[PDB]
Amino acid sequence: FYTSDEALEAATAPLYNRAWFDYNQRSIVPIGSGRANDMYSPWNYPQFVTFQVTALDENLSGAWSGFYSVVTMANSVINAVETQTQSVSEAAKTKAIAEARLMRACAYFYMLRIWGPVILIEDNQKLVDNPVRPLNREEDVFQFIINDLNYAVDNLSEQSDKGRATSWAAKGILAKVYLARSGWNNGGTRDEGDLELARQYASDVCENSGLDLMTNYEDLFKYKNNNNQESLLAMQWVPLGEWYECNTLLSDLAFSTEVTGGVNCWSSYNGSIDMLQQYELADTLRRNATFFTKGSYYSYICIKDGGYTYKGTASPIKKGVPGGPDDDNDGKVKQMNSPLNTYILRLADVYLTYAEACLGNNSTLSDGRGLYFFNRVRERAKINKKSSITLDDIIRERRVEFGMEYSNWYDMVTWFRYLPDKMLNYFNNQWRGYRTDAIIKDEDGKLHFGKYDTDGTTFLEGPEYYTAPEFTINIEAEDIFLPYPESDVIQNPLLNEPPVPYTFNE
Numbered sequence: 001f002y003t004s005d006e007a008l009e010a011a012t013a014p015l016y017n018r019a020w021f022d023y024n025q026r027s028i029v030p031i032g033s034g035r036a037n038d039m040y041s042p043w044n045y046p047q048f049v050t051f052q053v054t055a056l057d058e059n060l061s062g063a064w065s066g067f068y069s070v071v072t073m074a075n076s077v078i079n080a081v082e083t084q085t086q087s088v089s090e091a092a093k094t095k096a097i098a099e100a101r102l103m104r105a106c107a108y109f110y111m112l113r114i115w116g117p118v119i120l121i122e123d124n125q126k127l128v129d130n131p132v133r134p135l136n137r138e139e140d141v142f143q144f145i146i147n148d149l150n151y152a153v154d155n156l157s158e159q160s161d162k163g164r165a166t167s168w169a170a171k172g173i174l175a176k177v178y179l180a181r182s183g184w185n186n187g188g189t190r191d192e193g194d195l196e197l198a199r200q201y202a203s204d205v206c207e208n209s210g211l212d213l214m215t216n217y218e219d220l221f222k223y224k225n226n227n228n229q230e231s232l233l234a235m236q237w238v239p240l241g242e243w244y245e246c247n248t249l250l251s252d253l254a255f256s257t258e259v260t261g262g263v264n265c266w267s268s269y270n271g272s273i274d275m276l277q278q279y280e281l282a283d284t285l286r287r288n289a290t291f292f293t294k295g296s297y298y299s300y301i302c303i304k305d306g307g308y309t310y311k312g313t314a315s316p317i318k319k320g321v322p323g324g325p326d327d328d329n330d331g332k333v334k335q336m337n338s339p340l341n342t343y344i345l346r347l348a349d350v351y352l353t354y355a356e357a358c359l360g361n362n363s364t365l366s367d368g369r370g371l372y373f374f375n376r377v378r379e380r381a382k383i384n385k386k387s388s389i390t391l392d393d394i395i396r397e398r399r400v401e402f403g404m405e406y407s408n409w410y411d412m413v414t415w416f417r418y419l420p421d422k423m424l425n426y427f428n429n430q431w432r433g434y435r436t437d438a439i440i441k442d443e444d445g446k447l448h449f450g451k452y453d454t455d456g457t458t459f460l461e462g463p464e465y466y467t468a469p470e471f472t473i474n475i476e477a478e479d480i481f482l483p484y485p486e487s488d489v490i491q492n493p494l495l496n497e498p499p500v501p502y503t504f505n506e
């Protein structure tokens, strides 16, 4: 019985944390980043990188559970607005429905780029009464997402409490959705109507929001800057709160207690050879903020010991590894407990989305505001602007802008649905599963890949010294979308049957 706007807001707050917990607690890493080849470990979920995932994989069931937790929580909030409010304003009621529908849209948009067809649900009771329900078609899922985002665009405000969604966030996601739909199973061209809509929504955010990119890329990934102006939407973790409200990734991302102030950790992930090669030589700011590499210095990690220099010869994760409790983290670093929010949408994504929507079906983009906003991302990274861009420039730029943010894989699926032959060739040329013992730098700061001789000091350079994977799979169309989780298929055999049309309620 919610009797004030603030009481209702307390009920919608878990849409930003608890709802996402089953996904964030584990599977976000191998699905969003691993599968894109952002990083690799031979012991932690390598199958996601090498395309050898089985239906029994715990990450599939966890992700499925997490995304459906968002959907069903959203549905519960919408129901509560309509049945449990008694002095509550229409502004607050519509804001709550809008936040619920925004999150539901985000969950379905992730699922669409993991499994493809999924079950669309607006009535939780229908699911309870009969859980054996059919999949709906990819086109239905797109329309459902669009409808939810339309409501959020119309019913969120331009400004919000810090950490809460605005209409700019909804418009930014909607731009991404239209861009993703434009080429999806569309014979190698992008629908001009969807391109136009993507441009309209993205340009509105870029030109009119009054928001800007943070001056320093590294600042985006520090806890003191949670909910900075570039953060359009993020999971809002509560490190001093309940277990289901915490960001539990700290120990799985951090490679050594030397970068956690002594807090227990166990990561064996390293940035992939392919991913590391995406950073242009001049792009050291984004590279350093994403992965540690030999000799890189961090003034803001191990602050009490004058900063931190990585002295290993691998490429462990930096993004998501905020240092120890006293590294401007207000004591909020503990085992499996990170103070960082998890980004869902940054303004730089909208900039790059606008650029890609301006490129459209042309082979190059050499003028216009889309190119300007692409070049703002370059400028913020302190590297050269480009006088013209192609889709290949956009692919590279997105990988380096969003490395270790658990987003690159979803973008790669979108591209595969547009240009499947190009992207299968791309995936097969990423050297997935290859890793190497030693990555070092020369005088000019360029990375070199190889291993040490028996003496552990004499560097041997080149691919002949890489560690090859046990198996290199030829990646094909059938490999891209993941299988439905086996336990869920047992409970609902229609997950093995064709999708059917959704009956829309609007």
Ligand SMILES: [Cl-]
Pocket: 047, 048, 050, 051, 052, 053, 479, 482
């Ligand atoms: Cl796979």
Ligand SMILES: [Cl-]
Pocket: 260, 261, 323, 324, 325, 326, 327
């Ligand atoms: Cl510390």
Ligand SMILES: [Mg+2]
Pocket: 181, 182, 184, 185, 186
């Ligand atoms: Mg279509």
Ligand SMILES: [Mg+2]
Pocket: 473, 474, 476
């Ligand atoms: Mg095969």
